[PDB]
């Protein structure tokens, strides 16, 4: 039977990978950072509060200008806000109200959304007419879209509930590349700052590092015990962080191919919806199901602060490109900008 | 504020007015979540998820079918948390058809949906399909294949009542939610009216929540 031989070879390769990872484990990150100055206490407050959504907000994404943001709610509404003055710049009605992700183009000309309709909708914000219309409807996934991120004005990357990721050319409207290999349903995406590789996290309790051009899985990371819901790169592109339903954040390293840090508390028994870093990367902001966010020290694994003030589950958070503010959206139909 | 800032504030206020009007329009609609193992005929018509809109007695019903989602239910069922009602279709003619038995799979799915923590106070309208075929095949096959502890008559009415009681017995904590059971037919549009009656009860409870005397 060749199946038993292939299974034995897979087990031997897994043991070899474990042996290599343990041979590359010299000293923990806590041992190195035992002699650095701890961040004392960070007390951010709500500078802004955006009202106008009449249902649960599932996603937000910031702008490159660090002033405009887009948010998606269950009322069929994609609202583009000016966060400095709290003005609704745009209100886009969606054909499907079951939206779970949204993206904003780095150029600022397009937005994207998707969800249970299994379609990535690209909307053009800058037309000769004064309205925002559907510019593209990328179809081809057989499961719900959980995340989408722009590479440029013509390329997008999506993660779906069909255990696969996709890279689409918007002008052609076709899947340029298909990323397969996950066993569980993919929940989150994160692009590298250099935009040549990306990490995904799925419900198989694993994260996968893929190359965009080659279309293959470079690396696989398995530390969690439950479904990974969020993922985010470190600012230098050499590490990333994940949050899952086992009430733990985990910081993994690309170059050592190993988990570096675990952020957990005995008082936290709820899952993690969204994670993001600060500008320097020493702050890890994680949104939880217990109606508040936790600001962790990324180097010392200490709870630096708590962002409390949402009356329902924090569904998403985002940090601006200049690191000025952190905006959180929750199921209480309110967005809050914290500083 | 400058001139264009004032005009932007005016545009934002117009957007708020349109959003409030759209929300007021959306709040006057009844949401139904369609689920089954088990025959969607005569319930929906009489990729993605399927939308259906119809009108009955000045009530606009939106019905959502999620049968094409061959994925994990726990990562998208919370989207349907504030649904007005959950319609659940169970075939009766598949008590002896093996997928595990089909009706045991229906019972497991009903136990999962009914006792979910997002559906603690969400009413369930239970339709029992294919009663004529079930009556035809109840003489050539007994209920002992599905229920070893039947101990009842092999007629149509007793067997139908037994399956109905077996499906209603899965309602743990039956003090905040109700299960409505109806045997599907093709006469006088009663299958719609039952749903209407069911959702009417929910509105009354919501009204008793809105007037603050529930």
């Amino acid at each position, epitope marked *: 039977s060749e199946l038993d031989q292939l299974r034995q070879e897979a087990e031997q390769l897994k043991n070899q990978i474990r042996d290599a990872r343990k041979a590359c484990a010299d000293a923990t990150l806590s041992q190195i950072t035992n002699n650095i100055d701890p961040v004392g206490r960070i007390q951010m407050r709500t500078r802004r509060t955006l009202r106008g959504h009449l249902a649960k907000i599932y996603a937000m994404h910031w702008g490159t200008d660090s*002033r*405009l943001l887009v948010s998606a709610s269950q009322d069929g509404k994609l609202i583009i806000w*000016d966060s400095y003055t709290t*003005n609704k*710049v*745009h209100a886009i009605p969606l054909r499907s109200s079951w939206v779970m992700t949204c993206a904003y183009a780095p150029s600022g000309n397009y937005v994207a959304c998707g969800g249970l309709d299994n379609i990535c909708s690209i909307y053009n914000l800058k037309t*000769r*007419e*004064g*309205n925002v219309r559907v510019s593209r409807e990328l179809a081809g996934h057989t499961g719900y879209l959980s995340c989408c991120r722009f590479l440029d004005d013509n390329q997008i990357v999506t993660s779906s509930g069909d255990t696969t990721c996709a890279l689409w050319d918007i002008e052609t409207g076709q899947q340029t590349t298909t990323f397969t290999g996950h066993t569980g349903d993919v929940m989150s995406l994160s692009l590298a700052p250099d935009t040549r590789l990306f990490v995904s996290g799925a419900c198989d309790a694993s994260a996968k590092l893929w190359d965009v051009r080659e279309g293959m899985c470079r690396q696989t990371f398995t530390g969690h015990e439950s479904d990974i819901n969020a993922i985010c790169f470190f600012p230098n592109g050499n590490a990333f962080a994940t949050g899952s339903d086992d009430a733990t954040c985990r910081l993994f390293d690309l170059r050592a191919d190993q988990e570096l840090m675990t952020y957990s508390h005995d008082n936290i028994i709820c899952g993690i919806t969204s994670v993001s870093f600060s500008k320097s990367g020493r702050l890890l902001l994680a949104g939880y199901d217990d109606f508040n966010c936790n600001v962790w020290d990324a180097l010392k694994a200490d709870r630096a602060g708590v962002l409390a003030g949402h009356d329902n589950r924090v569904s998403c958070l985002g940090v601006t490109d200049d690191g000025m503010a952190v905006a959180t959206g929750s199921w209480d139909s309110f967005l809050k900008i914290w500083n | 504020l*400058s*001139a*264009e*800032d004032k*005009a*932007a504030v*005016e*545009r934002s206020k*117009m957007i708020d007015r349109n959003l409030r009007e759209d929300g007021e329009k959306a709040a006057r609609e009844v949401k139904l979540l369609l689920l089954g193992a088990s025959g969607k005929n005569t319930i929906v018509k009489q990729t993605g998820i399927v939308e259906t809109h119809f009108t009955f007695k000045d009530l606009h019903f939106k019905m959502f079918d999620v049968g094409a989602q061959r994925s994990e239910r726990k990562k998208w069922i919370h989207c349907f948390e504030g649904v007005t009602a959950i319609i659940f279709c169970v075939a009766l003619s598949d008590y002896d058809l093996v997928l595990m038995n089909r009706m045991h799979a229906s019972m497991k799915l009903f136990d999962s949906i009914c006792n979910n923590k997002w559906f603690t106070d969400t009413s369930i309208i239970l339709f029992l399909n294919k009663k004529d075929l079930f009556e035809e095949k109840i003489k050539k096959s007994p209920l002992t294949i599905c229920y070893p502890e039947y101990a009842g008559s092999n007629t149509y009415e007793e067997a139908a009542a037994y399956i109905q009681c077996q499906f209603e017995d899965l309602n743990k904590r039956k003090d905040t939610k109700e299960i409505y059971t109806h045997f599907t037919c093709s006469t006088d549009t009663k299958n719609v009216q039952f749903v209407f009656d069911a959702v009417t009860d929910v509105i009354i409870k919501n009204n008793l929540k809105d007037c603050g005397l529930f």
Partner: single-chain antibody
Amino acid sequence: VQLVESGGGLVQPGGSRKLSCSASGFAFSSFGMHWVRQAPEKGLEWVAYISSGSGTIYYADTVKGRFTISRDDPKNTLFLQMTSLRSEDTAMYYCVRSIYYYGSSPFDFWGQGTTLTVSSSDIVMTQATSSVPVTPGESVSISCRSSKSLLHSNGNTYLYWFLQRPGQSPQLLIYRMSNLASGVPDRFSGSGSGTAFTLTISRLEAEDVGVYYCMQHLEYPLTFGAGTKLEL
């Protein structure tokens, strides 16, 4: 996208006339609308403005109490009713499209205009250059001065640069300071500070011949400057 105005003609003084403008090719209800007139031998003069949704109805001082601006959004039509007409109302009337949000481009599209002939605390925009001789392939700079500083506290400088080709409606070259409009080639640049401004054309073609107009948008009334004419 087009705006076609209608009406006009010869009116005896003291009369009344209703100018109309039909809008096509854009979402008319989402745009604020302006009426701007041009004297038969002089520059551009702003007349009236109506907002999106008709919540803000503002007029110029010289036409206040006699002119009425209105809109029919299902009919996609803008109206300007004129009573007690003077001989100074003889002009070429343009209907102007203007949307306002963060990063928008107001005064982007202009109508063709209609001719009306009648028988017989404001920022002063000053640009002293006129009849500037130009050569193709050469860089030309047009200056602009404002009585009040146009740098608002939000960091924006409300300066608009327009081009008037012979026999053509004005076209928006630059909407806010150092912001090129859509369809404008990357040889027009706009710079300045406070009350001093300049428009630089790196290498002008034969299509860059016309009258160049300043406009401010810090405060309403919206005043233009007496334009600078470029001739070969």
